[PDB]
Amino acid sequence: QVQLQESGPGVVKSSETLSLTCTVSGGSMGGTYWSWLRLSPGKGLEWIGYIFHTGETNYSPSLKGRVSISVDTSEDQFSLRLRSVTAADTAVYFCASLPRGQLVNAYFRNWGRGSLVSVTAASTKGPSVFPLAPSSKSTSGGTAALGCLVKDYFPEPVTVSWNSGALTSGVHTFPAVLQSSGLYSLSSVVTVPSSSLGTQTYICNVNHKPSNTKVDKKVEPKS
């Protein structure tokens, strides 16, 4: 009967202030700690802070100094502001509520649906491409993995091929990770017969259209 609605998802430019609001429908604004939490791959589910109708706040020690929460007890709304965001602040942000009182056994109720906030860099940057060399060791009938590390580019996407498209079997290009810097990296690996090393040449072809960069890198066995 009580529903919380967060402001929609958006993008915030790295270094700026993340700003969200939660609107409360049903019940009263009293008797409650109006709360914010977030969920991300890199830090899991985290409580951020809460506010009581009097305006008294409590914040995670991890964010104390750059987080602020406010409430409007007539408009039934509360806010989250988080200063100096970096890529690490990319997460799904949730509002929720806790009953006023002792918290040792308390659980969050009336969660909002969540709003994805992506903290994004601004400037284009082409990748560096490093070989991921296979061993020159001999497996009797076995395979070796070799690849290319496509490091520190922005924005997405990067495409990768092998031997200009002539090699497709055993090729697996992995989705990118986002570093704290706001730059992406990914890897492409091909699984080949270990006997083909030293016979067949393997070149990764990396395209980053946003920076108008292409790189070809031969990947050879560790010397």
Added chain:
Amino acid sequence: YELTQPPSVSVSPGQTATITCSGASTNVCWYQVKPGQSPEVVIFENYKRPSGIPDRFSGSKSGSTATLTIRGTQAIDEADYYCQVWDSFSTFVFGSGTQVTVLRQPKANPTVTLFPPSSEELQANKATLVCLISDFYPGAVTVAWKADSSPVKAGVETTTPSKQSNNKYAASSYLSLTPEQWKSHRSYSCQVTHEGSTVEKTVAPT
């Protein structure tokens, strides 16, 4: 600090799911989290059910380990489950989360491939360890990095598992080091946990 949960718990249609939450000194509650939906508590004070939650959800706690049980797990129960405890300093601490899956294909444990920093990267005054994880099901894993035998959390980035062509899942994890850190340690390892299995690979400077 997070409470430790298995990344993946899965059952055949008809079976009961058991999810553990370790490191909890006081009472635990559990949230069901699905993509794009409001989380909701399913169990609080270790085993108590809020109104509206079906009978098949139950709980137990012994010492510092809490368990969530879902009897005759149904499609509607498929979700990520997070445990939570109160904390004197942080107010609330949560578990790492457990994906619950009803198996649509056989369980498959990951293949792990670990590459050391390339000589080229070291020449650019950087160092990246690359851990590739593939051919697993269900699509949830925990990746842990070690310097020698000690856990390393800083400089780690890990992707959310994505479906491959063969309908299994893959993921990758990266550890950023300085060349000095790379050269001064005996070895670094990537350890992947999935269901009953752990796979660790280790590399060392040359």
